[PDB]
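Can you give me the bound-state structure? Components:
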Amino acid sequence: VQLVESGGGLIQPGGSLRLSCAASGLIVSRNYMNWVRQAPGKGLEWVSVLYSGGSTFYADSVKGRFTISRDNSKNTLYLQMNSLRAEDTAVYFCVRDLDVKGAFDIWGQGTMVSVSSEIVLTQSPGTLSLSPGERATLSCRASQSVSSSYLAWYQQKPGQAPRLLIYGASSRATGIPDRFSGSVSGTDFTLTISRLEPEDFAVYYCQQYGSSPITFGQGTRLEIK
Amino acid sequence: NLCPFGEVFNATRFASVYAWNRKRISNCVADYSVLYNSASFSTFKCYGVSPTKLNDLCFTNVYADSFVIRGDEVRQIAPGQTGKIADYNYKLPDDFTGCVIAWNSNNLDSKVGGNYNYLYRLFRKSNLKPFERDISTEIYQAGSTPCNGVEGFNCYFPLQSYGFQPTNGVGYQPYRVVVLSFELLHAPATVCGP
Ligand SMILES: *[C@@H]1O[C@H](CO)[C@@H](O[C@@H]2O[C@H](CO)[C@@H](O[C@@H]3O[C@H](CO[C@H]4O[C@H](CO)[C@@H](O)[C@H](O)[C@@H]4O)[C@@H](O)[C@H](O)[C@@H]3O)[C@H](O)[C@H]2NC(C)=O)[C@H](O)[C@H]1NC(C)=O
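Here's the bound-state model for the whole set.
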């Protein structure tokens, strides 16, 4: 299974681009397919979704400018981007959503675009500095109540797409080691790494998908002390 | 005889939205002010009819469709809407004639640890037609490999429980919904007002 994006570029403000996402293994027309973007040095922002039955939804900031579509015969998802703004500068990821059955589990590698209300999730600390072997606790607090079925944790290493760790607040994704665990206590959603391995140093994002729009926390950078 | 709206509105258990219930009302008298006067209904939205005029006409058929959804989904039970509920569970027609009535049922339909009795359809190839009902449980093929009725990666049971919990925020709490459709055809008109 793979998603392969293309079509990004370095473009003048006001221009247009068309992003493509060629899928293999999953069928675009049968899935909740999304575009998610990440501005340089910033967090993740949901952009658009196309339902299997054809309904489309967009972030307020791109309404009337971007259009999501697909070509079933090419098993490809598209994002038409018109009237591009500096604030649209980001890496754009193609993503399949399983919602409460598995969250954002398949991500593409991303394509770079350079141009030159909602539940807020607050992550703490901004930077977490710890030694290998130690326990790490990462917090994510929502601006209003989010049921535990609709919370997920992601890990992102440099230059890579995010990777799903935990969905439904506490269900580990397939292949994730048991030293990762998720829990909810009050309005606090926590990720615990019981014994830090050197490969665990990364940026971690929480996500809620229970209220529209889908939103992400601003990220915690987990680094070596 | 009084129309049996009590059986619909005050039923102990409601249907899941994917398996939504329909009751035909006929051969009876109703006072609709009993419904529209009620401070219990957080949604009471009518299309093509005014609720204060429903008492003025004998109808040929009244249908009462009822089910439970999340509070944040009640907005999808309206003409012209889209989303998981409108698209794959219960679809009103674009020019619906009737009323949509809803109320919070947290005290009845939530359970400690989650109520798994109420389900919705998460996956469906295409949108429902208006008033269509899909109660199938065929494993849903999201990939290129056939599922052959076995769940796995890219092969999903298409329904999902809401898991209503009493401490959820109100947008995540269960709401009971009754959709009243009003028809007048060239037929006996047996559903009357006072
Ligand atoms: C399902 O069971 C419910 C519980 O019994 C039924 O609710 C009752 O319905 C009757 C008939 O309409 C009401 O009695 C009338 O009350 C009005 C005054 O209404 C005002 O107060 C109610 C609250 O009691 C409020 O919701 C309204 O906004 C009004 O401000 C009088 O004018 C009548 O003479 C008569 O006494 C009951 O008050 C009401 N009970 C409750 C707790 O709401 C309901 O009708 C049943 N549903 C069906 C379809 O049969």
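A couple of observations. Residues B 5-6, 9-10, 34, 37-40 surround ligand 1 (CB under 6 Å). Chain B touches chain A through 27 residues (CB under 8 Å).
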